[PDB]
């Protein structure tokens, strides 16, 4: 099985190993597209405290194709990490970052107390809002929230509040420590998929009867070096009767001719059983390396002793041989 070199990986590392995250009230989004989604750096990592998929199991995810993958990132308290899930409610789930009940994706989070703390009030969350958020919405306005019946007129006051509240993140705080949260949302649209996981390839064995899968084509046969060249964009060659002639190898870009695995009729050459029960066997149109062994044009003949002396023909084999 052969697939081409992966030189275009999805930037999960850029999202996860970022020097800075956004506030949850103003969470960031980056689109992941037209790349290979290698999740082996996410699900085999012991550094994450939270790793839960609400869409599809990680064991299948690394073999699925999507049109778009979105990585939503923000910093919240450890006690609020549990709110980042479908069906949940709370100050973060309702006013800062809402996931739909039918969310398809994975929520990954880890402790960032060794960096994102001081108090560090750079990270903020929405405390008040007129109504909750729609799935994947964002609200970064600073309009003063009116809790009472008296117009706020743009300022704080009796039953009037600035909508945001900062996090008091300090190095000495588990529930009040900062956590970096990344949500990976995966979708399949009517559009062609653009992001697939990596595919593994096997080594290529030459001059042997094998099954094979090259890119998107399959078949069986023997792979040998070709003496023909293809145009720069061509992936495989085809014969007159529309059968595969050759394939261009995805990693080496070398061309390998494909021949059918040796086959042919097997016939028994025998004197009449009235005089002898000794027989010779002829394998038609095959090599003796594939099956008193005599290689001829008719096939590989076993049991008959080849001699230099010619005689009038008795039992015909073919191609001048009797």
């Amino acid at each position, epitope marked *: 099985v052969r697939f081409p070199n992966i030189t275009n990986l999805c930037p999960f590392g850029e999202v996860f190993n970022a020097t800075r995250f956004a506030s949850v009230y103003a969470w960031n989004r980056k689109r992941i597209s037209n790349c290979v989604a290698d999740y082996s750096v996410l699900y*085999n990592s012991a550094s994450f*405290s939270t790793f*839960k998929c609400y869409g599809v199991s990680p064991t299948k995810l690394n073999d699925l194709c999507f049109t778009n993958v979105y990585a939503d990132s923000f910093v919240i308290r450890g006690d609020e990490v549990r709110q980042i899930a479908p069906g949940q409610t709370g100050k973060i789930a309702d006013y800062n970052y809402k996931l739909p009940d039918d969310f398809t994706g994975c929520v990954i989070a*880890w402790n960032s107390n060794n960096l994102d703390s001081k108090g560090n009030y750079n990270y903020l969350y929405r405390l008040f809002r007129k109504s909750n958020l729609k799935p994947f919405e964002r609200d970064i306005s600073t309009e003063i929230y009116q809790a009472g019946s008296t117009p706020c007129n743009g300022v704080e006051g009796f039953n009037c509040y600035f909508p945001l509240q900062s996090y008091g993140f300090q190095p000495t705080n588990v529930g009040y420590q900062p956590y970096r949260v990344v949500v990976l949302s995966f979708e399949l649209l009517h559009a062609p998929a653009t992001v697939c996981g990596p595919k593994k390839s096997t080594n290529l064995v030459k001059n042997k009867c094998v099954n094979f899968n090259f890119n998107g084509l399959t078949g069986t046969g023997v792979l040998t070096e070709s003496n023909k060249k293809f145009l720069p964009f061509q992936q495989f060659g085809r014969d007159i009767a529309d059968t595969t002639d050759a394939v261009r190898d995805p990693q080496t870009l070398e061309i390998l001719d494909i021949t059918p695995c040796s086959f042919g009729g097997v016939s028994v050459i025998t004197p009449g059983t009235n005089t002898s029960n000794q027989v010779a066997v002829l394998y038609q149109d095959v090599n003796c390396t594939e099956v008193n062994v005599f290689q001829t044009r008719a096939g590989c003949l076993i049991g008959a002793e080849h001699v230099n002396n010619s005689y009038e023909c008795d039992i015909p084999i073919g191609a001048g041989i009797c």
Partner: antibody, heavy 119, light 112 residues
């Protein structure tokens, strides 16, 4: 068809040491996480150690830290546990198991090798 | 560090449904996947339920479960109890304070 085969149990004195092994086939070792899980008689299950697919990293439960070493050989198709300074409290049945991914399930289990510590 | 605990004695009549629970402390059980294992006497525990609600081949649809995130707990239910279901059941999850965390086990008896 995936199978796990264990050996190396028996009676050891306190402060002594031994190596347990879990030979296996039906899969490529370098593609899977390998673990040891312990169960003392009359007790529930507890985790002892975890080793990464390529052996590049190792994890231990605090109770065996500094005493037990988890190691693997992907060419010999076998998982090993080297247990040093064994204590009376370490008397237990040791199981080997295969894990698809770090936070996933233990898909295959051995039968369990009994180690008894007594002077 | 995060730990799991279970009830010792759980039992129910054959043909009926029994609930086996597991609770967490010093961390959140719902932040990771929960597995359930069944150990019949004489051998090793094997997976019955994994990743909250999935099951391996050989396990019937009588085995299912969920995680109650607001209660920091999880459970499985076994419907249609058979006398072959007598076993020691275990819960397992993952944390950063304790990599692989197992519960103390539940003894399930089918009241035949």
């Amino acid at each position: 068809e995936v199978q796990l085969v264990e050996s190396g149990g028996g009676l050891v004195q306190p402060g002594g040491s031994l190596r347990l092994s879990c030979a296996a086939s039906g899969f490529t070792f370098s593609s899977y996480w390998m673990n040891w899980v312990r169960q003392a008689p009359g007790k529930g299950l507890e985790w002892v150690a975890n080793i990464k697919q390529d052996g590049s990293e190792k994890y231990y439960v605090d109770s065996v830290k500094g005493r037990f070493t988890i190691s693997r050989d992907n060419a010999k198709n076998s998982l090993f546990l080297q247990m040093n300074s064994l204590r009376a409290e370490d008397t237990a049945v040791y199981y080997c198991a295969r894990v698809w991914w770090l936070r996933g399930s233990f898909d295959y289990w051995g039968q369990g090798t009994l180690v008894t510590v007594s002077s | 560090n995060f730990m799991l605990t279970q009830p010792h004695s759980v039992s129910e009549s054959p043909g009926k449904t029994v609930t086996i629970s597991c609770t967490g402390s010093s961390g959140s059980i719902a932040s990771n996947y929960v597995q359930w294992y069944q150990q019949r006497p004489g051998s090793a525990p094997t997976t019955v339920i994994y990743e909250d609600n999935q099951r391996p081949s050989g396990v019937p649809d009588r085995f299912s479960g969920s995680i109650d995130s607001s209660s920091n707990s999880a459970s499985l239910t076994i419907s249609g109890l058979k006398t072959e279901d007598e076993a020691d059941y275990y819960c397992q999850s993952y944390d950063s304070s304790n990599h692989v965390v197992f519960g103390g086990g539940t003894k399930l008896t089918v009241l035949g």
